[PDB]
Symmetry: C2
Subunit: 290 residues, 2 copies
């Protein structure tokens, strides 16, 4: 009835109790150097700050999540960490059941619970956050796949002539549209800035920042097209701090109406924010303990 939720990410490693709402939120510095020891200690402190306060642990986590292990498809999103015994480290601190699930899959399970269930049977949530991640609901069932890969739509093809992605594959969507991909360009400018800063020189109509935010949305627009015509998607919410940025969804919708109408789809802002992973894992774990 009472859940300890963790949203492990590249930037955000959240934690919260989910009674039926979020409460007692925390938000640690997801470590970017000495990360193997750093994540053991963070999982230790957070597990201590809540002992006896929960009946199960629900972990939404960046990376492929499979038999308790976190395999980082893109190690650049984890300070270099290729792998991590996620469930084990957590079990060193509590006896309660522990469910684990990719972070984007957890959000898509959250956002899907706000949808008219027989108007919308195929659904996709797209986070444009640190990287680019997704989860795929088909016939109301969240897809995870036999290895927990299903949903890793940020490493589908964006441009066969584009940047090498941190995963080793050329031209991924993540390598072109992600917060990381934006920052790789905006740091090397004569007038450097971080992603949030790119979004405001964008609104002031700086050529450079607009060309860069457009490159990202046009790629996300193409991702949605691929999704619509491959799986017959009926609605797409997009989350993440770049996705939820102001004026971005409009730029996606704009680039999406260059496509034959058949590729179009209803797109909405994620209605759960930085708390979609927590809430998703909390409900998704609970519903596969029944």
């Amino acid at each position: 009835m009472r859940c300890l939720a963790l949203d492990i990410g590249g930037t955000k490693i959240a934690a919260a109790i989910v009674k039926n709402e979020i409460e007692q939120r925390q938000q640690i510095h997801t470590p970017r150097e000495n990360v193997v020891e750093g994540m053991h200690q963070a999982l230790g402190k957070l597990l201590a700050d809540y002992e006896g306060q929960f009946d199960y642990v629900a972990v939404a986590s960046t990376g492929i999540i499979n038999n308790g292990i976190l395999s980082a498809l893109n190690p650049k999103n984890l300070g270099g960490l290729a792998e991590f015994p996620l469930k084990a480290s957590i079990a060193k601190h509590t006896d309660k059941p522990i469910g684990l699930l990719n972070d984007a899959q957890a959000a898509t399970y959250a956002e899907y619970q706000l949808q008219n269930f027989e108007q919308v049977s195929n659904f996709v949530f797209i986070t444009v956050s640190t990287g680019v991640g997704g989860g795929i609901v088909l016939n109301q069932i969240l897809q995870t796949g036999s290895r927990g890969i299903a949903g890793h739509i940020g490493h589908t093809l964006a441009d066969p002539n584009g940047a090498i992605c941190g995963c080793g594959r050329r031209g991924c969507v993540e390598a072109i549209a992600s917060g990381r991909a934006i920052e790789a360009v905006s740091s090397q400018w004569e007038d450097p800035c971080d992603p949030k800063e790119v979004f405001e020189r964008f609104r002031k109509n700086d050529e450079k920042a607009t060309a860069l935010v457009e490159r990202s949305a046009k790629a996300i627009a193409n991702l949605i097209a691929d999704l619509v015509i491959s799986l017959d998607i009926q609605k797409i919410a997009i989350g993440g701090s770049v996705g939820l940025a102001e004026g971005y969804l409009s730029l996606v919708e704009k680039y999406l109406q260059d496509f034959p109408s058949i590729y179009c789809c209803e797109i909405e802002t994620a209605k759960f924010g930085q708390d979609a992973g927590l809430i998703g894992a909390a409900y998704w774990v609970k519903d596969v303990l029944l």
Copy 2:
């Protein structure tokens, strides 16, 4: 128990009885001019050549198939035909039940019946034929989607700087890897030839034909990668006359091993050939009459 199967395509409009094997095959000229009248008359003749010989009709057909209508996503694959009352025209000639299904979805349902069902739960068949088509089995269930679009993987993104596709979208996989896409290049040569001819100047190591068959496989290789990492696919058979061409699958497998191993997948030749659509529709219709 006795089925009249039709495989409607861009080049091939087949027909056959499926008792439990194919028999009495036919193979008409899929008309490329005056096609609306042409397809009514072909559906008339074939329905007459078999009256009383079947208990139901099963139609595998190129195009989105939805409430009896064939909507051509790419009208160039149908001699211009944007739409066709497929089921209606067939009902003008028999009282028996009539099931309809996209052609690539029908093949993927065939080929999937030859698979170890709990070694392989996510499966994809890719036809590299006139165009590029697919069907997606997830958790042993063939995906069609609420509008029969699911599987139209030939109109996912291949190159955002490539040819406009006959569907209206820039850079589709079909526009780069299909038999049509090959022929559009090999006709305009100083020494023109058809696709089959491209595959033999290829084997004799003609620069031009190799550059062209490589462009197609490298794109199919990228499609498989997208499929593996999006949906956690476990095996992929590829059919169609370009797919089944000799030395092509090897070129796909070759370009696929440039990818991080996580993107790799077991790939096999389709083991049903020009009869996968017929057999697929025949079994798939029968199993959704129970």
